[PDB]
Design an enzyme around this catalytic site. Sequence first.
Site, PDB file in Angstrom:
ATOM      1  N   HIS A  10      -6.213  -1.360   8.133  1.00 28.42           N
ATOM      2  CA  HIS A  10      -5.289  -0.615   8.916  1.00 28.42           C
ATOM      3  C   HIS A  10      -5.351   0.793   8.741  1.00 28.42           C
ATOM      4  O   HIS A  10      -5.705   1.012   7.648  1.00 28.42           O
ATOM      5  CB  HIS A  10      -3.913  -1.347   8.627  1.00 28.42           C
ATOM      6  CG  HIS A  10      -3.811  -2.713   8.911  1.00 28.42           C
ATOM      7  ND1 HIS A  10      -4.155  -3.673   7.872  1.00 28.42           N
ATOM      8  CD2 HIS A  10      -3.123  -3.343   9.813  1.00 28.42           C
ATOM      9  CE1 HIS A  10      -3.810  -4.682   8.086  1.00 28.42           C
ATOM     10  NE2 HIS A  10      -3.159  -4.651   9.296  1.00 28.42           N
TER      11      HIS A  10
ATOM     12  N   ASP B 258      -9.416   0.251   4.356  1.00 31.20           N
ATOM     13  CA  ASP B 258      -8.367  -0.728   4.806  1.00 31.20           C
ATOM     14  C   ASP B 258      -8.409  -1.166   6.218  1.00 31.20           C
ATOM     15  O   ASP B 258      -9.448  -0.586   6.798  1.00 31.20           O
ATOM     16  CB  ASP B 258      -7.143   0.207   4.782  1.00 31.20           C
ATOM     17  CG  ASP B 258      -5.763  -0.559   4.748  1.00 31.20           C
ATOM     18  OD1 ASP B 258      -5.639  -1.528   5.399  1.00 31.20           O
ATOM     19  OD2 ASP B 258      -4.949   0.099   4.087  1.00 31.20           O
TER      20      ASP B 258
ATOM     21  N   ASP C 290      -2.409   2.792   8.342  1.00 29.34           N
ATOM     22  CA  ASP C 290      -1.434   3.327   7.514  1.00 29.34           C
ATOM     23  C   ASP C 290      -1.066   4.726   7.921  1.00 29.34           C
ATOM     24  O   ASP C 290      -0.347   5.188   6.882  1.00 29.34           O
ATOM     25  CB  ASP C 290      -1.617   3.267   6.036  1.00 29.34           C
ATOM     26  CG  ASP C 290      -1.800   1.728   5.593  1.00 29.34           C
ATOM     27  OD1 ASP C 290      -1.780   0.765   6.493  1.00 29.34           O
ATOM     28  OD2 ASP C 290      -2.205   1.613   4.303  1.00 29.34           O
TER      29      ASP C 290
ATOM     30  N   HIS D 133       4.982   0.307   4.198  1.00 29.12           N
ATOM     31  CA  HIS D 133       3.575  -0.086   3.701  1.00 29.12           C
ATOM     32  C   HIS D 133       2.461   0.247   4.714  1.00 29.12           C
ATOM     33  O   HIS D 133       1.251   0.421   4.690  1.00 29.12           O
ATOM     34  CB  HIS D 133       3.342  -1.624   3.210  1.00 29.12           C
ATOM     35  CG  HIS D 133       3.998  -2.469   3.944  1.00 29.12           C
ATOM     36  ND1 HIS D 133       3.369  -3.051   5.182  1.00 29.12           N
ATOM     37  CD2 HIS D 133       5.263  -3.216   3.816  1.00 29.12           C
ATOM     38  CE1 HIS D 133       4.101  -4.059   5.599  1.00 29.12           C
ATOM     39  NE2 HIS D 133       5.221  -4.526   4.738  1.00 29.12           N
TER      40      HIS D 133
ATOM     41  N   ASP E  52      -7.591  -1.084  -0.246  1.00 28.64           N
ATOM     42  CA  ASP E  52      -6.613  -2.157   0.169  1.00 28.64           C
ATOM     43  C   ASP E  52      -7.355  -3.286   0.407  1.00 28.64           C
ATOM     44  O   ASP E  52      -8.316  -3.255   1.156  1.00 28.64           O
ATOM     45  CB  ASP E  52      -5.987  -1.710   1.719  1.00 28.64           C
ATOM     46  CG  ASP E  52      -5.134  -2.800   2.094  1.00 28.64           C
ATOM     47  OD1 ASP E  52      -5.112  -3.988   1.839  1.00 28.64           O
ATOM     48  OD2 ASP E  52      -4.016  -2.438   3.079  1.00 28.64           O
TER      49      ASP E  52
ATOM     50  N   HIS F 260       0.841  -1.386   0.034  1.00 28.20           N
ATOM     51  CA  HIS F 260      -0.018   0.106  -0.012  1.00 28.20           C
ATOM     52  C   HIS F 260       0.928   1.195  -0.060  1.00 28.20           C
ATOM     53  O   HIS F 260       0.421   2.359  -0.150  1.00 28.20           O
ATOM     54  CB  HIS F 260      -1.004  -0.088   1.162  1.00 28.20           C
ATOM     55  CG  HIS F 260      -2.158   0.988   0.924  1.00 28.20           C
ATOM     56  ND1 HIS F 260      -3.439   0.406   1.607  1.00 28.20           N
ATOM     57  CD2 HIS F 260      -2.668   1.803   0.082  1.00 28.20           C
ATOM     58  CE1 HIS F 260      -4.165   1.376   1.339  1.00 28.20           C
ATOM     59  NE2 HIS F 260      -3.724   2.087   0.276  1.00 28.20           N
TER      60      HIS F 260
ATOM     61  N   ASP G 289      -7.420  -5.858   1.976  1.00 17.48           N
ATOM     62  CA  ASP G 289      -7.606  -6.348   3.384  1.00 17.48           C
ATOM     63  C   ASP G 289      -8.686  -5.758   4.225  1.00 17.48           C
ATOM     64  O   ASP G 289      -8.952  -6.106   5.308  1.00 17.48           O
ATOM     65  CB  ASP G 289      -6.138  -6.607   3.897  1.00 17.48           C
ATOM     66  CG  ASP G 289      -5.639  -5.294   4.490  1.00 17.48           C
ATOM     67  OD1 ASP G 289      -6.527  -4.216   4.685  1.00 17.48           O
ATOM     68  OD2 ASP G 289      -4.445  -5.262   4.951  1.00 17.48           O
TER      69      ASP G 289
ATOM     70  N   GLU H 107      -2.520  -4.662  -2.234  1.00 13.57           N
ATOM     71  CA  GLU H 107      -2.284  -5.675  -1.518  1.00 13.57           C
ATOM     72  C   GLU H 107      -2.954  -6.969  -1.556  1.00 13.57           C
ATOM     73  O   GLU H 107      -3.098  -7.792  -0.722  1.00 13.57           O
ATOM     74  CB  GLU H 107      -2.632  -5.296  -0.088  1.00 13.57           C
ATOM     75  CG  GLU H 107      -1.991  -4.060   0.478  1.00 13.57           C
ATOM     76  CD  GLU H 107      -0.685  -4.187   1.225  1.00 13.57           C
ATOM     77  OE1 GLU H 107      -0.554  -5.503   1.895  1.00 13.57           O
ATOM     78  OE2 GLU H 107       0.239  -3.524   1.445  1.00 13.57           O
TER      79      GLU H 107
HETATM   80 MN   LIG Z   1      -2.712  -0.166   3.836  1.00 12.49          MN
HETATM   81 MN   LIG Z   2      -3.957  -3.324   5.010  1.00  8.73          MN
END
Ligand SMILES: [Mn+2]
Ligand SMILES: [Mn+2]
Lengths: 299, 299, 299, 299, 299, 299
Positions: free
Chosen positions: F124, F122, F126, F139, F226, F99, F228, F271
């Site tokens: 997360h 996402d 980031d 990332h 992303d 990412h 995920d 990702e």
């Molecule tokens: Mn990310």
């Molecule tokens: Mn992620």
Amino acid sequence: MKPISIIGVPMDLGQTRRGVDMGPSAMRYAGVIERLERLHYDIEDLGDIPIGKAERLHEQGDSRLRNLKAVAEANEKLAAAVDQVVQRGRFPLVLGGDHSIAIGTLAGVAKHYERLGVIWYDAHGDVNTAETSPSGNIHGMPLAASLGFGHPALTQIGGYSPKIKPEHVVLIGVRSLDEGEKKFIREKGIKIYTMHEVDRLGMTRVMEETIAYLKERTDGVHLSLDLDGLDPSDAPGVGTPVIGGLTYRESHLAMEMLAEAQIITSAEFVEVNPILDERNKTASVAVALMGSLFGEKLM
Amino acid sequence: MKPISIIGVPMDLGQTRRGVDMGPSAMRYAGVIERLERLHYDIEDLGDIPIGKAERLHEQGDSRLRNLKAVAEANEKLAAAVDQVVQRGRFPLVLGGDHSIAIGTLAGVAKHYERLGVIWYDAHGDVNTAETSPSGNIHGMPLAASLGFGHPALTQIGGYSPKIKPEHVVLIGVRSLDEGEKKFIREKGIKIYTMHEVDRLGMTRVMEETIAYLKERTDGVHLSLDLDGLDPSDAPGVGTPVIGGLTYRESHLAMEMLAEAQIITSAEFVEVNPILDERNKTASVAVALMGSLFGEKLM
Amino acid sequence: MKPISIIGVPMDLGQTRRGVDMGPSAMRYAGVIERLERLHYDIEDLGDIPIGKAERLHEQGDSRLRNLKAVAEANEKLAAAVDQVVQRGRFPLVLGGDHSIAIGTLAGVAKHYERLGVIWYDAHGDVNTAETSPSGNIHGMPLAASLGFGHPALTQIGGYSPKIKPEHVVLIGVRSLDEGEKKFIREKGIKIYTMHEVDRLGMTRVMEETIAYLKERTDGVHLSLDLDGLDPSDAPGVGTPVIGGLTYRESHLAMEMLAEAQIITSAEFVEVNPILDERNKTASVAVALMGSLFGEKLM
Amino acid sequence: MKPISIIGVPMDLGQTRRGVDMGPSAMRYAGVIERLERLHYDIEDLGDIPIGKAERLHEQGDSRLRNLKAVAEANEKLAAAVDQVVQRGRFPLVLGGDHSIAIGTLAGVAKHYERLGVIWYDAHGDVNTAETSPSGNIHGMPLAASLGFGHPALTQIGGYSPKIKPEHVVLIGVRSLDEGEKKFIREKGIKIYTMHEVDRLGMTRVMEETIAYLKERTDGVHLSLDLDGLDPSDAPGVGTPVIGGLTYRESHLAMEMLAEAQIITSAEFVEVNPILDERNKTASVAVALMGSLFGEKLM
Amino acid sequence: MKPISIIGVPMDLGQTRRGVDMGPSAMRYAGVIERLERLHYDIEDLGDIPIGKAERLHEQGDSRLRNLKAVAEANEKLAAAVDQVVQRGRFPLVLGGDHSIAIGTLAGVAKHYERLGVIWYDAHGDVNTAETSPSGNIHGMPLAASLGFGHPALTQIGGYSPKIKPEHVVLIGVRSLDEGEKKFIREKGIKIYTMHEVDRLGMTRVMEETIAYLKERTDGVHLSLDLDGLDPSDAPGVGTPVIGGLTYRESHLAMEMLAEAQIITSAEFVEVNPILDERNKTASVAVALMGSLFGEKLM
Amino acid sequence: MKPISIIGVPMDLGQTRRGVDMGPSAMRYAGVIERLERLHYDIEDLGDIPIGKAERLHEQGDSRLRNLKAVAEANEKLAAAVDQVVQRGRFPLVLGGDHSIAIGTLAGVAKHYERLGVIWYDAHGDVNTAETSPSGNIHGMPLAASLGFGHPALTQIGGYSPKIKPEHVVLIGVRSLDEGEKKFIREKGIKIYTMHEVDRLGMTRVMEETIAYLKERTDGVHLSLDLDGLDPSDAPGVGTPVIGGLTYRESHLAMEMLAEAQIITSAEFVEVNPILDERNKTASVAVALMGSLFGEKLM
Ligand SMILES: [Mn+2]
Ligand SMILES: [Mn+2]
Ligand SMILES: [Mn+2]
Ligand SMILES: [Mn+2]
Ligand SMILES: [Mn+2]
Ligand SMILES: [Mn+2]
Ligand SMILES: [Mn+2]
Ligand SMILES: [Mn+2]
Ligand SMILES: [Mn+2]
Ligand SMILES: [Mn+2]
Ligand SMILES: [Mn+2]
Ligand SMILES: [Mn+2]
């Protein structure tokens, strides 16, 4: 947005007066013009349709249809006026007394649409006929007549009938019907959200369902709003008040939703009665509702 | 459907009058008889139970129990009258002043059922005893007395006690309780939907839960409706008005649901006070509610 | 629980009076002290902040800021008084007239918190500035001023600014905003539940969302409740009534929820106007709400 | 916050094994200790309660109660261990196999509370008795037994009964019941949110209602979470998987809400079965849920 | 309740096989008979309709209508069998392979109703015609053909057409359509709830709307459930899996609601494909759904 | 509509590989080009940005910024490529591994907008920096760096900083954050919908709020998705899978809503990790989502 043309119809032609003829004046007093101008609309007030006098102690007319001539004649003129407004590419906003004027408003509008839908916001169904009406008051027959069921004098206004199909009508707020009306709604298959449905579903859902239903099957939608659809606590000044009605909040929400939906192509706010009103409250409520219908947003 | 017998109990026996004795008269004026006849019921008005006069300033008495003798004697006669109505296979509909009359109504009814349930629609819990009552007013003790808790002159009316079990009572609309009443409701495990619960759950859910609960555990259900359960905006004319109550719409819905459910086997509409009413509005609201309870449908 | 200190600020300093200066007196008459004592609070009434007289039409001043001096001076004193109450570890409960006093209340409170949040219960946003205000009334600017946007005389009260951050404010019941206010709310990113959101979400959800939001990001929460947030039917006696507001039931629920949440660290009930009130009804409503905010439970 | 003491009970004593005895080991493998330490808890792992072997064929016993002696004896020891943990002012966290261990957990906990409430998160009701159980498996009777219904061997564990009252139990996620269990839930009046209610209300509402209900009537709340309450897609490794369950998201939300509420005073995560699990997934899910229950926040 | 007659139609006649012919066998293996018997139904399994072999290449084939003769002949027999079941006053439950069999099922059922409605639960619309089908597979044309749009060979099955009107069909779970199908649904005005609507409205609302819609305009309702309407995660073994489908929970809820509604007069569960299934999971899912449709309640 | 230019960035430069470098290849294999062509887009695939190898152990490299040179150099080239695509009036669609490439994508895009907004979908946040990152993996820092926080090597890419303002970023699906990240989001005031908010509000509301927020304050919006962000059950093949994510249905709905909104001016799907994927499922999910983002409608 297209310009708006207000037309007032000071009609109070039931067997006995209810004070609703003063509705247009009261709503004007409440500032309908100014409210709409602020929203940046090009709006004009065409004035009022002339209404013949009611039947004296002894005049010619049909027993089963109180003041048929005056009612029909007034509606014929309204139909012409409304037709012209639509011709001019303007939005017709009819203010009134008797809900009987819906016959005239729909007569002038409908001919301009392939499948005109109608949202009938009222405490009553207004689907009586000379045959089913206990009173003979035409103000209790406007919807039936417009569907093509009523006295020839009413069903043919504007030179045609019917103006709309039952599948394109949605009744909202109904809480007072005659047995014949129940039968009519039932047999004609008219979509209806009684106060019971509003209670169980909530106004947001009622409106979403209504808007989606008509949207997927009409090319124009007329809003025929009778102030008595609201509860007398919010709208005391109406011709025939009926307890257990819609709140101002539910009605305000409904108007905002219709506005967002962009489906309303014509509208009328009727039955305001200054005689039972408290400091022009109901007339002010009508104007606030019109304000929401026309784009007024709280944020 | 079985016939209905109306019994009026013009009782206004708290320490000081509240005007509720005129309740039966007001509801009759509002057309209770006619309303029910239109629904096609065989209904009779047995008239009123005679009520003894109130005690004065410094008479002999029980200050923990204002007008105990007159209250007890009136309830004893009512219990007899109600008992006979049930004996005749008729539905007893008691109209009243003080909610104290619930003692008499329940005394006449309960003995005819194995597990009689009760829906107590009121702004107050009515579970005080001579020990917990700040006032000593028996109108604030009817539910407790009927459950067998309280002073003996009240708990024994009809020749037995208790008339009902706590597990068969559901309080609705409560918004005003004494600490002892909170303790009572709590310790006795009485099911209760305060205004808080109605706000969070909505009347439709409250009624569905109530109806199911009682239905699955009783062989008859008595509706003891105190008009003050409704908000003073809808029902101004009550003995002890309390702000923040049920709307007429929620109450109307509740009555329609009970009607559909078919669980109500006896009922009483009480505490109507003409002195604080506006043009018999509250009495008319009581009659409309009775109408719904007895089958009146909006469509 | 900590003790409470009531401070009254009889301010009615808009260009023209609205009668809200009588608010503190009316709420004291409605029994705010007694109500709180019954809940077992150690509470004192410090009295009223002195207010300078209003300006006359042709006197030197600030047209963009009506009665700036008197308003600023009164708020400066209030800030000091409130600061001291907090210093003493007591809960400051400010009663008032103009919502302008929020500037003073927040000035005294905020400095004692790292991240003070605010629930602004009102029909109006109160985020106008000298630049945006059509009237120049400071009572329509208290929230903006407290956020640090506006004329220095108001933003610097208490010797600092801003008192709060926009991310820590939640507006509830808003239904009347100037275009500049809409822009302000929008650009500053202030969380707001207009009547539209309350209608669609219901007060329980609105309050849960609000409480959770502020709880997860503040170390103290101030409640600035303007009685006009309620509908004029419930709270007729307010400075600037606006139709379509919150019901007493929604407001009572809201207060109970805040109480349960334990997040309110200071509060103020303002804009009560005896001139438009009906038998001290609105002042009574204010006291009942305070009662709920402070722990009064219906069961 | 108080310290936590983990107690494992590797019981798999139904008529035939289901692999749930390995539950504690799998959850330890999934890092329950480490997860809680990171949250800064003083936590200890007391180890496992010894479990007797199960009756085979030519062993004198009963079909109505599979492995009654071993089950009872193990629960008796667990009750003692749990009791001591509570005595020490520590939070007891029981990890297990059979949900039968709830008998032991509640036996050790309940005696320390006036009104202990219980949230039974499970796909099954666990309210069978020797009389109603089709299988005779005690793991299908823990709730009933704890309520005081069932073989004395189970109802008397810990030297008393019942451990809890039906009004203090809330079942969540139920989707599999025997007719007798339906009757039991019904007759005992146990509050229950079946998958149907979760679908119609949503987990946030379910949890708010549950938390409020118990909070307003108990002095401690025990969480008895059976991993099969979650859908087998999220929790494949369970003793008796049932399709149509709660998602991990709903369960994670529930745990976060309970944490916020601060009402859970003891808990147990049971029925994890490594034999049907995928790479210790279900054990990992149990640990993440415990993490949320104990304060882990996503922001 | 009336008896049930199961009829299996092991048809896998698209251009290339998909394994759905094994559907009936798999569902029988999953225990459909036993499931319904436990619900106390008088049910019989009439067996399977014989299916002709599919065209290979060097035969009288049609690239616009793959296996037209065999498909038509099989549907003609099915129609007859279904007709007889209805004649006997029994509920026809058709199990199948290709959704093409809906042509036969509707042919046998429809003639017995004035206004037969249809709930088409599927990932696909099945409204292709020889003209619009990219593949020529009749399994992608059953709804259109039944509405009277398609090859005479299919539209005339049973000796009549159409079997149903577009206004009486409601599509649910659709997420895969050809442009011609979008046009068809659109132009014919078929009510459709795509996954998008399910996401925004929720299954409870979708089902309430659907049930009400059909109930107010039909005298019998046929349920044509294609297992691929469910997401491949819940129903992996289907002929043409499409990601993003209905969950088992939504489907289970739907079946329970239809059962409660009592509107389904005939039904068919089709497209089960053992080749892509995991341990007969999808077949078991079909049976659980049938169980709910026929009265199985979780409490 | 404007043409689309796909740019692949096969970067897998964390301390240790995660297999995401193969993402672009997998999505191409899943048919991204073909999917978009069917929607009638003029689309080109510019190929891949060359990526330098990563440091091992006995090589120059900062532990606080793993593979800083390679990462920065790759992003610098990407920024140039993206810049040119925008220059040509084409829509840049970047496909990727890490990412971290968001740094390069935003560097090339942002300079072309006054107020560029960003929707960061996402698991997360980031928003780590060399200072807050436990791992030193870039990332986990792309959003912070783009906001102007991080190593100059990253913050200055493209020759400027910051690329965007915190008020123009909306995080969605977040469920995994470092304490420093929580502090960052908090202090910078970044709008965020964690899984908790999605659970309580529902994706439709989350998206409506997000779309409206950004629309009312930006002149272009970049979607940084992303994979995920979706739950591993729907998107198993991702670099760093986190349980409890968004369903494919919620994500599909989100893409459809963004499409309708017409606010997305650039996008990137990153990702995707073939090593943890099941038969290219996640890559196919990515392509279906892109299909929706670009206009694919289910009806
Ligand atoms: Mn990310
Ligand atoms: Mn992620
Ligand atoms: Mn009318
Ligand atoms: Mn009317
Ligand atoms: Mn009472
Ligand atoms: Mn009362
Ligand atoms: Mn204010
Ligand atoms: Mn205000
Ligand atoms: Mn269990
Ligand atoms: Mn279980
Ligand atoms: Mn099909
Ligand atoms: Mn299909």
